[PDB]
Amino acid sequence: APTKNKELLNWIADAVELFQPEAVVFVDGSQAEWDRMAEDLVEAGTLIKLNEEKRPNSYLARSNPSDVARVESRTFICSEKEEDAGPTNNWAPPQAMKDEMSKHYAGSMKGRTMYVVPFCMGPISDPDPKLGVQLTDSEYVVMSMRIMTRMGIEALDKIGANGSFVRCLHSVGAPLEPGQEDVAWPCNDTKYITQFPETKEIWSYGSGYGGNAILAKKCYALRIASVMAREEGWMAEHMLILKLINPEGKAYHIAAAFPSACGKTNLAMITPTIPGWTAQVVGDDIAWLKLREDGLYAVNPENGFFGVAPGTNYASNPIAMKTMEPGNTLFTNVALTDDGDIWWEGMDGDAPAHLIDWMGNDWTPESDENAAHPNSRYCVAIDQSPAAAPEFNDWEGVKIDAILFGGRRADTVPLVTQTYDWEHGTMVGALLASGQVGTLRHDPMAMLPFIGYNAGEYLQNWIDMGNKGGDKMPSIFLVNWFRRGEDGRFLWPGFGDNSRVLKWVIDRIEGHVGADETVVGHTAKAEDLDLDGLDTPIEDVKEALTAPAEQWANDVEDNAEYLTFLGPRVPAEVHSQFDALKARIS
Amino acid sequence: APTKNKELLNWIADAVELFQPEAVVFVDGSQAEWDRMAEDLVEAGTLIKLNEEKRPNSYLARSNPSDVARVESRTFICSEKEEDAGPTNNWAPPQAMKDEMSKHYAGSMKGRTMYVVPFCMGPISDPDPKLGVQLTDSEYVVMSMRIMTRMGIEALDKIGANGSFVRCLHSVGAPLEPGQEDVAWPCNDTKYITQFPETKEIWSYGSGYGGNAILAKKCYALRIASVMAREEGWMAEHMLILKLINPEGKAYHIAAAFPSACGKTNLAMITPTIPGWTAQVVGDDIAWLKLREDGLYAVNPENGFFGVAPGTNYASNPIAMKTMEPGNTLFTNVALTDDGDIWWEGMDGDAPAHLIDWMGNDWTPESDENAAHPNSRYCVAIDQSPAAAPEFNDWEGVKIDAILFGGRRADTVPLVTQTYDWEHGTMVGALLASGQVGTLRHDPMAMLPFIGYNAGEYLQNWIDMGNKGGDKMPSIFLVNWFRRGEDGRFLWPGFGDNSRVLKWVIDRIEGHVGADETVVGHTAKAEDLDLDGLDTPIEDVKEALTAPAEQWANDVEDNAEYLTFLGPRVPAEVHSQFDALKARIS
């Protein structure tokens, strides 16, 4: 118990009375502490240690099939007023959810140890950092947390004697009776994930899996962080931060908000396919931004990658594969090979003829069920990446030069377009969606499941920042890599070739321009685009660059409905940008 | 007061105390009473009377854009235990919910009349009817209840001095101070629809619209009613009920669950396309089924049609159109002509030069915005249909001979296929999906927003029903009108011609047609369909009746995760049928 913080300890003190753990242990975040936990969990059944000359210090977790992601219907924003959760959030009364949850918490830790996990959400050298503590009965969550945050003694020292912190409560809801044998993956048929914005608490129950259990991941870094960003004057976002360095060696940084699971990751870790361009990753998931006075700066509140495994391979993400090469990775619900290595769908070979699947069953390729679950994950530290940006651990943040929004659309949305200004940009984000009334799948800012308050106010935060902020805001772009030919073929190759789209972007914000105007905005002229090496020469699918106004007309009503959906706090400014859009298509 | 019902009188006393209405008015059901409310609402500027020479005794309601459907975000099944609400429902603790809502209900009828709306769910001739009473401050709700239910003094006399009922409370949430002028459409930015299954009560707040306010439709008819069904050994389902009479003689009755409204509307009021088959509607929305002596029998609990107006014309649904040609229709959020008739998109009456849209603005066929909102409705008496089955008012119901499940699938699912037995049919409904990986859009039983308790336990109800009924159970079929060729066009003309399919379901029941074995079950051989006339499909028909096993093997992981998602009350019977399906798929 290395702390003199009276709040910390009383809170811990009430938790122990309720939860009733067998013992309590402050986590220090040490390598011995990790080793000790690996071996406890290898002895439990929970982790399988991977072949050491394949993948050192690397483990596979298989979860109970019903505890493998998500649980939206039981994830609540418990603000005091229903209207501060808003239409995009679940809500239920804050005290009665506390009462509901203690009924479940009472005794939940009996037969188990309660770990006290201090943590900090960005570089420890920031003079004034966001901080939390999690109480959990899961050594798995303690290990994942070691990779995903700055955990342990340094962060208990940052909280200090009088510092504050987000308080996180977590139990997998599987108390043991004396002399009672346990399971590999403990969990409950009742699962709750509850955020309480006013008080900055996060309380989870019944789930040992990813985001429900690693309360740092979405609950903190997006849902609660977003409220702090609202209350304080900054932005917590679902952005990748990428750094792009040209042949001249100039550095530029690009924030991008994509719904795509690993759409984000394959650009966050891109290898440019154009000579002289390299890129480094600052984060692939979450971006906290504030206004310094000479620009918008982003930090990554995370310390690790927690990426979707399927589809990851040396053609599509060699940087993610080169990161897991030294080992030191927690894999969850991926397959196991006869070599004691791991596999998943989309890997560079032919499917192996035998595996053990994420369920523990012999598997052959003629199974129609997947060897690795669709939501399966790797969890590895960011600084293990060969393309890890040297300034990813530095509190100053990186200056953002451009923000991208995109979704998958088969039609309508050009490959790349430059917005007019932030307010225009805020509207285009609000309408962000995927697909081809009711048919478009809407994901405003790629934040839909993660806004921790009223989504229309969240768009007013955007408007506020651009004004507060003025001519120092970076330009917003709209991309889309998924246009399809009348045939049905993808028009733009994607993958490492999107670097050509990112150069175009860099070439606009400086002014070596070329845009010919569309309803959507300032869009690539399509031979201001570095297209050397592509499909087969003479090329020029400029079809990916159309925004045919009939297509835009088709969308007008759905978009009109959605903005109404978003409610009474949708800013006057977003509605006006939307008028203008309709004036423009008309 | 016309009632000696003391439970009932207490309950009104209590709501009156809470709500503080200026006046309490028991509603009789009469025509003069309706007339007098339409006059009040025409004065309140709430409704517009249509051209009497064109649409007798009909009205246009226009709602505030802010309450135009929806509020699934705030629709709660408040069981004491959260898993009684289960993974397809929103949950919040009962008592906590009564207090939140009483905080809003407190004084909301200030300046307004509380209407007491006694009502009957189904034929009024039934010796033990499901009855209800709704308290509301909206005369548009009362008007709508008179089309949609058997309402008024008859219903209050059936309740009697000692009758039970469902207690349904409703306020729009717009109380009026001494000075204060009213608005044409009152409501509140805070909206709630809470079902309490144990106590059989429904509370609504903040919305005057559709199924937020009309508590019979949806809240009582499906949600509360499925709870009752599960407790009492019957079924409440989201099925049309169609009478089909074959050439010289025989009457069949087909129930059909489609996730639509107009997919169902178009089948319930189908006019056949084959010589000597005639079709009559018993219902187009909700079915209450109960095993009798020789089979499973269905009542339409509803008294009125409440269908989506756009898309409705004399080519797609002329029975819909002829039901309305006499007038007595209450329209909501359709468009309004310059001489006082209505219009909506998909009307045969192509491009009027000018309309007023459902928002009060002038509309041209240049606007990119719909004149009729897409969820726009007409409400009209079943009685008035030229195609109405005389027996829709029988308390003993119609015997069901086949049940159809259908979703909108461009590929995979054959045009029509017969399931093996009730327990198989049950798995086929569990997996019912559309789209129109993780990309299927599931709707088990076309029930997903409506199940009033644990979804897997609802599957368990189908199973238990199959077991009570044994061989008296109707054959289940899976249809798919929406299959597409290599060029993106439909293989099946549908609309009137789905009668050709309906005839094969009938031939198949009676055993006069064979079947190609697919992975799905017994699918129609093309050569066993038609009747000629088909208007131009070649055996494109054959393509639509295809069940390619690669597309099926593709969906296996999807469907497997979905049965997992539905939880630990998913019957073993359903899992066993899915194993059998995976078996056939290899």
What is the distance of C-alpha B436 from the center of its chain?
Answer: 18
Q: In whole angstroms, what is the distance from residue A101 CA to residue A19 CA?
A: 11
Out of B368, B387, B406, pick the residue that ends a domain. B387
- CATH code for the domain in which residue A536 is found: 3.90.228.20
Return the structure tokens found at A253: 């940084």
Which residues, including other chains, have CB under 8 Å from residue A487's CB and lie 6 or more apart? none
Give the separation between CA A60 and CA A329, rounded to whole angstroms: 9
Contacts of B437 in chain A (CB under 8 A): 374
Q: Is B53 on the interface with A (CB under 8 A)?
A: no
Taking the C-alpha atoms of residue B505 and residue B515, their distance in angstroms, rounded to an integer, is 11
CB B382 within 8 A of CB B284: no
Question: Are β-strands B355-356 and B335-337 bridged in parallel, bridged antiparallel, or unpaired?
Answer: antiparallel
First to last CA, chain A: 67
Question: Does B377 show up as a binding residue in the annotation?
Answer: yes
Q: CA nearest A132: which of A237, A49, A203?
A: A203
Give residue A245's region: left, alpha or beta (phi > 0; psi -120 to 50).
beta
CB of B64 within 8 Å of any CB in chain A?
no
Q: Which residues of A touch B96 (CB under 8 A)?
A: 92-93, 95-97
Is A567 within 8 Å of chain B by CB? yes
Residues B66, B18 within the same domain: no
Residue A92 has, within 13 A of its CA and on its CB side, a CA count of 28
Neighbours of B353 (CB within 10 A): 7
- The helix (run of H) or strand (run of E) holding residue A47 is strand A47-49
Q: Among B83, B96, B582, whose Cβ lies nearest the Cβ of A96?
A: B96
Last residue of a domain, one of A338, A354, A387: A387
Asked whether the beta carbons of residue A100 and residue B87 sit closer than 8 angstroms, the reply is no
State the Cα–Cα distance between residues A208 and A65, nearest whole angstrom: 12
Q: What does the alpha-carbon distance between residue A148 and residue A151 come to, in Å, rounded to a whole number? A: 8
Query: How far is the first Cα of chain B from the last one, in angstroms, to the nearest whole number?
Result: 69
The HSE-up count of residue B337 (CA atoms within 13 Å, CB side) is 16
CA atoms of A33 and A142, how far apart (whole Å): 10
Q: By CA distance, what is B436's nearest residue in A?
A: A439
Same domain, B309 and B409: no
DSSP B393: G
State the Cα–Cα distance between residues B104 and B93, nearest whole angstrom.
Answer: 17
DSSP state of B267: H
Question: Could you tell me if A122 and A185 are in contact, meaning their C-beta atoms sit under 8 angstroms apart?
Answer: no
Q: Do B150 and B215 belong together in one domain? A: yes
Q: How many whole angstroms separate alpha carbon A239 and alpha carbon A263?
A: 11
B149 and B114 both lie in a single domain: yes
Dihedrals φ, ψ of A413, to 5°? -95, 120
Q: Which two tokens stand for residue B129?
A: 């009817």
C-alpha B272/C-alpha A289 separation (Å) is 63
- The reply, when asked if residue A179 is annotated as ligand binding, is no
CB contact under 8 A, B557 and A368: yes
Whether B222 and B257 share a structural domain: no
Nearest to A461, CA basis, from A563, A570, A352, A304 = A570
Subunit contact B91:A91, Cβ cutoff 8 A: no
Domain count, chain A: 3
Residue with tokens 């409560």: A169
* Range 342-371 of B in CB contact (< 8 A) with A: 366-370
Specify whether the CB–CB gap between B206 and B189 falls below 8 A: yes
Which of these three, B387, B418, B441, is where a domain ends? B387
The answer to whether the beta carbons of residues B418 and B514 sit under 8 Å apart is: no
Angle, CA of A146, A149 and A152, to the nearest 5°: 60
Q: Is A288 helix (H, G, I), strand (E, B) or coil?
A: strand
Are A128 and A243 within one domain? no
Is residue B562 domain-shared with residue B489, that is, in the same domain?
yes
* Distant-in-sequence, close-in-space partners of A413: CB < 8 Å, separation ≥ 6: A406, A407, A478, A480, A483, A520, A547
Residues in B 422-461 with any Cβ partner in A closer than 8 A: 436-438
Statement to judge: residues A14 and A104 lie in one domain: yes
A209 marked as binding residue: yes
- b/e for A98-108, b at 16 or more Cβ within 10 A? bebbeebbeeb
Amino acid B151 reads M
- For residue B25, what are the β-bridge partners? B115
Which of these, A441, A468, A71, A147, lies nearest to A305 by C-alpha position?
A147
Q: Is B377 within 8 Å of B308 (Cβ atoms)?
A: yes
Interface check for B9 against chain A (CB to CB < 8 A): the answer is no
The amino acid occupying position B373 is: H
Check whether residue B252 and residue B313 sit in a common domain.
Answer: no
CA dihedral A557, A563, A568, A570 (to 10 degrees): -140
Is A211 known to sit in a ligand binding site?
Answer: yes
Domain identity same for B345 and B492? no
Cβ contact (<8 Å) for B189 and A91?
no
Give me the phi and psi of A241, to 5 degrees please. Answer: -115, 120
Nearest CA in chain B to A65: B564
B31 and B133 in a single domain? The answer is yes
Judged by a CB distance cut-off of 8 A, whether residue A10 touches chain B is no
- Report whether A281 contacts A242 (CB < 8 A): yes
Q: Helix, strand or coil for residue A108?
A: coil
Q: Rounded to an integer, what distance in angstroms lies between the CA atom of residue B314 and that of residue B242? A: 19
Nearest residue on chain A to B557, judged by CA atoms?
A: A369
**A245-248 — which CB contacts under 8 Å span 24+ positions?**
A245/A277, A245/A278, A245/A279, A245/A280, A246/A276, A246/A277, A246/A503, A246/A506, A247/A275, A247/A276, A247/A277
**Cβ-defined contact of B557 to A92 (cutoff 8 Å):** no
The residues facing B308 across adjacent strands are B377
Residue pair A195/A202 in contact by the 8 Å Cβ criterion: yes
Q: Where are the alpha helices (DSSP H) in B149-182?
A: 153-159
Structural domain for A408, as ranges: 234-302+388-586
Please name the residues in contact with B110: beta carbons below 8 A apart, sequence gap of 6 or more. Answer: B20, B21, B22, B175, B176, B177
Contact by Cβ (8 Å): A543, A491: yes
Pick from A89, A96, A189: CB nearest B568:
A189
Residue A446 and residue A433: Cα distance in Å, rounded? 8
Nearest to B369 among A89, A560, A567 (CB): A560
**Chain A nearest CA to B218, separation (Å):** 20
Catalytic residues of B: 262
Taking an 8 Å cut-off on Cβ atoms, the answer to whether B567 and A66 are in contact is: yes
Q: What is the resolution of this structure in A?
A: 2.3
Q: Is A266 annotated as a binding residue?
A: yes
Method: X-ray
CA-to-CA dists, residue A315 to A326, A345, B130, angstroms? 19, 14, 63
Contacts of A154 (CB under 8 A, 6+ apart): A29, A120, A124
Q: Do B369 and A95 touch (CB under 8 A)?
A: no
Q: Count Cβ atoms within 10 A of the Cβ of residue B16 and give its class: 0-12 exposed, 13-18 middle, 19 or more buried.
A: middle
Neighbours of A64 (CB within 10 A): 16
Starting from the edge strand earliest in sequence, which strands make up the sheet with A398-399, in order?
A235-237, A287-292, A295-299, A398-399
- Chain B partners of A519 at a C-beta cutoff of 8 Å? none
Print burial letters for A541-551: b (CB count within 10 Å at least 16), e (below 16): bebbbbbebeb
Taking the C-alpha atoms of residue A423 and residue A521, their distance in angstroms, rounded to an integer, is 13
Determine the distance in angstroms separating the CA of B560 from the nearest CA of chain A, rounded to an integer.
8
Using alpha carbons, list the distances in angstroms from residue A74 to A78, A342, B83, B562: 12, 32, 11, 17
Residue B436: enclosing H or E segment and its boundaries? none
